[PDB]
Ligand binder design. Sequence first.
Ligand code: ADP
Ligand code: ADP
Ligand code: MG
Ligand code: MG
Ligand code: ZN
Lengths: 97, 611, 606
Amino acid sequence: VRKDPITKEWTLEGGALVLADKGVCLIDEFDKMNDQDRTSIHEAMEQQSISISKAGIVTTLQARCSIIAAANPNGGRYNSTLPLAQNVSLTEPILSR
Amino acid sequence: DAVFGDRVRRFQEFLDTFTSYRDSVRSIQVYNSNNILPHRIIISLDDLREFDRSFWSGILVEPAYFIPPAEKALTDLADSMPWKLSFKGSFGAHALSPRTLTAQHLNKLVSVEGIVTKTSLVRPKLIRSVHYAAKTGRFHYRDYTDATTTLTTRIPTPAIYPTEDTEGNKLTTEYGYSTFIDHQRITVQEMPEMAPAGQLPRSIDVILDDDLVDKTKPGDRVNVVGVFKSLGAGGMNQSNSNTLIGFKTLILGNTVYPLHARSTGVAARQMLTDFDIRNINKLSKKKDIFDILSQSLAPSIYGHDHIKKAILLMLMGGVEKNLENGSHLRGDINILMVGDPSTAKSQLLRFVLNTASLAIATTGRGSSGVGLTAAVTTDRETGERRLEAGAMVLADRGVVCIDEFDKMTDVDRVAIHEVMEQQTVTIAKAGIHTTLNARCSVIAAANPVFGQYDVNRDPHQNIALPDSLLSRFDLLFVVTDDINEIRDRSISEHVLRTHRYLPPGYLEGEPVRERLNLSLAVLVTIPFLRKYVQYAKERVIPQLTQEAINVIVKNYTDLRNDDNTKKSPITARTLETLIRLATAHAKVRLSKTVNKVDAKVAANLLRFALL
Amino acid sequence: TEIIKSFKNFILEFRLDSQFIYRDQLRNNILVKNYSLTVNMEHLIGYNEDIYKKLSDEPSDIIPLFETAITQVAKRISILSSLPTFQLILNSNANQIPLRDLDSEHVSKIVRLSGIIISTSVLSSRATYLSIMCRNCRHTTSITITVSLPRSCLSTKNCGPDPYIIIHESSKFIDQQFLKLQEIPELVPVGEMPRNLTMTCDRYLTNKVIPGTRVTIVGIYSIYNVAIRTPYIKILGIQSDVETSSIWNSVTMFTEEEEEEFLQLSRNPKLYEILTNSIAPSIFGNEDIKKAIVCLLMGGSKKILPDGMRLRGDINVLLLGDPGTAKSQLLKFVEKVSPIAVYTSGKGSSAAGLTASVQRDPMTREFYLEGGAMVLADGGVVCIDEFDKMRDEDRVAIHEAMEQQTISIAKAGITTVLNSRTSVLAAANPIYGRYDDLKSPGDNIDFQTTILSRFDMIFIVKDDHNEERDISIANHVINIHTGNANAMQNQQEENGSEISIEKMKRYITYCRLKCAPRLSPQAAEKLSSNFVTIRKQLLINELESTERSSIPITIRQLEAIIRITESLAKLELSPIAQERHVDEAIRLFQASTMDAASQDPIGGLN
DNA sequence: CATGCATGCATGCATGCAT
DNA sequence: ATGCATGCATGCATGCA
Ligand SMILES: Nc1ncnc2c1ncn2[C@@H]1O[C@H](COP(=O)(O)OP(=O)(O)O)[C@@H](O)[C@H]1O
Ligand SMILES: Nc1ncnc2c1ncn2[C@@H]1O[C@H](COP(=O)(O)OP(=O)(O)O)[C@@H](O)[C@H]1O
Ligand SMILES: [Mg+2]
Ligand SMILES: [Mg+2]
Ligand SMILES: [Zn+2]
């Protein structure tokens, strides 16, 4: 819930996942996200919706979109001696969707 | 012109019938014949309803044409044998909150309850200005008035400060012979306990003057009775101002009450009658008093007889000292519990939070160590860097209940060392250097480091707290859940007995109803326990005697040189602890001398806690 | 004149659906103190189209006529069967115009819009009857309602310009409110800021929506002030489209027909089975989990004692197990079939917290509850997925919320004990990706084993690899996709064998609101004897061994069973709980928790 | 809205102790 | 010798004028 640069007006802006409903979200550098991004992507990929409770606005928004993501392995080189789950930073709950 | 006099007469004959208020006129008047009490009387609207319904409905619905006549009648009575009026009783639909106040209620007498969110700086207001003319040697005077002075509307007058006399002689002000009256403006909001979650709250301004100008502080729960008014012109006078504005509204307060809640600054209070005092004195004679007052604390919990005795002693409290030089000796009692899960710890913390006259609750990782010690270096609108009170500052002369005390980090635990023993909070940071009072007591709960108490290991391996902190806690108790057969049968029967209980005036199967408890401030039941505690704490101060001196010095010396193992170390503080406990017990008996039994009981309690 | 006559005739005789509706609506409203009338605009394309086309065009001139017509017909209604002007709410169900297509051609006309509210200001006072007086000669008069006060004295000895003052003690006012509408944030352009609009309502259409609600508006596209003006909308009616449930908007009124239906259902001799079979019929097996999810939705019976102690009456349930056992789908189902429910994870939701948060007001700089899942859902259910990962402050707060049913805040300046009376349904997954048989249950979790004593029932669902149940599950999940298990196979079962989602939601609300069972003296003995037995066989096995049991048995489980037994009697509207219910309570408790201690090397001995 | 100082909170790293 | 826990030091977020 941000402020508009020109109209001095509040705006409820959903992320790329709520803005890509009935479309596709293309995510680059998928392995270098902070806590907020991981939580948002987890909710989107679990329930295909995003909740929000900010500044008097309590609502839910639809995020029925497909996700295509790109990433790089730990250390910058894939190690075939280990399972894929140990070559990437992503945990299992996000890697099972 | 004629209705005014008729209303004056109708209020005079209302006073004539009910003679109570007549009594309360000679009262604030014979005493002002050598703090001058203020000339405000309080009337119960229920009596005014049962006397004259029309006059009652007029006050409720049309105050501006009914209150000034009553004030004039009251002033006439006082003079014969000005005075202002305050109202209490039922208000029906007029009792509202900041959320439900609408344009339907403008120009009516209302009562609104909420949280005080923003007070102002009290200032004087000019009401009469005197002048001296030396050339003629005479005194003159001018009068001033404004919208918020009277309820009725009066044509504005051209306020102008006189500088020259009619004859031309120059004037000089006589500041000491003028008249000034205090004025404050406050803001009230909807309480967090009632406002819907996730929605921005609603506010209302209130204006106070004269003797109602400073009676509440920010963050308190308040109930204001006053008239809802309208002022100015929302662009109506102007030829072209706007089409998106309205009239400004506020409340002309005439009564303010502080309300007591949980985890709130205001302290509960009851009015003690002759019957209550007589009953307390009669009850204090029985020899098992310390057990009657002790088994009645949380009677739904099984056992823990000694923690309950400690709770009562902490509630009563000892006596502090102030030496001539300026030294200060602590007089409070603090308690720590370390226990296994499901040992009724948090249920005893909540009992204290609900029965103490003033207590504030806090969890562990929840509140930081600056949120407890009041390091609120902030800034106000005036620009003065100010300290905002905290949990321990607000709990001055109260109690602080700390749950999950072991989760509190050291950087947070070390801020409490000063408060628990020095009873002050000295804050010295950029641009600010001040000291506040934190004369509180602490009751805290925690669990071992291994999840359960390992009897094989040494206590220091389980409790895992510094000796510095452990010394400040007067009594440290250890509670263990040991699986038995005889004990389990008793504790199950008791628990199942509690879960089969019906409040009076209910039908088996009918759900019970819950409500918020906002009281009006100023085995035995809980109310009698509160009354007993208030009387004992307010009107008793025992003194030490030689017998207690001997018992305490014997016990301390014996404990210091011991071959046993203790849950906590022994220092000089322990001696003071023995003196505190003794005094507390002497306070329970309503005695002015700490006798020998008090000291013996203190010794037994400490020995049970330690060994 | 003819306009007012036609409107009066319309109100007095329309008689659609073989019944006159506006007449009786006025009769009811004039009694319930609601000085307003609601009329559908399509109804006016019938009785008379001339007035409809005269209203849709130049409405600013016609509305007042209709309102005074309503006032003069309410006069007749009152007399045959002093009040103010009657307001007209104007609903519609015609074609809508996108908020981005409003342009000049729509100025000063009735328009239909749809969007989401994002803000609502405080109420404002506007004048409807002014009393004024001349400050020089004291001439008094009045005004009725841009109007302004008399420019010169009307007494006509020169009072001068602007001689009148407003006498507030005798004037009348009404309410007003402003609202902001924003276009749905899901069809915005592909990287241009969304548009928004301003709207103004008054009288009986104030305090009817809260921010975040999806709504439809019918209003007038009006304009207010190089030759550029500011458009806005004058509200004539609002219709809520998408909302969120909560404690304050709950409905406690039951129609007589609904009461009879529920009373008939309560006597079904196979109700406990129909309810179970209605819980997520699209998953295979998991009978005991569903039976516990049913007892969860009813709760127990809260008590208050004369010492002020509060006893809990809610059920908390925990589910551990391997991946792919439909334990996340169960939470999603529990969210859809409860009156109040929130679904979240351990680390909160996107831009929404997990527990109470106290932030400062955007404008007033004052303290206010931002909103947390454990306070938004008071009186409902909270479904926490991935219970094993979350912050420590969240843990410490939930521990209090789960037994004392409240959250305490002590921040600089604000100290308050809130209310959070909810039931926790938690799902977690064991560490290492599978539940090992060799390790104790306490060593398969990623948090303190002291937490497992909090919950009332713990289930350990394990995925065993078998060549029979694999084909069974494959056939079951192939059928739901093929469509033969769609709404063809569960509609046949609604004939006394299954309940719908909204029927059962109401049946849960009715039960919660009407019944509060109480054990019987025989059930007390049968509950007190099983407890003194389960705890001997733990002391025995713990004394024999050196380590302690990961799954402990505490006094919190005696009350957990008193709650399972009181919950099994509340779905039949029964006022007393009997040993017939204690037997089922014991049976459920043995399949969840004691079956979890059955797998501990220490507690599961013998 | 950028610059730079002082408070307070959070995180990640290192060291020590125990198994 | 390895792993886990605790304490400390480095970083960031706020708040400011
Ligand atoms: N001695 C006891 N007598 C009665 N009830 C008890 C007793 N000990 C525990 N309980 C019950 O067990 C529950 C444990 O909750 P709580 O008091 O929070 O445990 P803890 O000791 O961890 O704080 C309470 O609801 C309480 O009613
Ligand atoms: N017992 C079952 N019966 C029917 N479908 C099932 C069953 N177990 C899993 N599924 C399928 O698997 C999905 C559930 O996976 P999910 O719940 O996300 O895994 P987890 O429970 O580990 O979080 C659903 O789409 C469901 O159709
Ligand atoms: Mg506890
Ligand atoms: Mg899952
Ligand atoms: Zn005049």
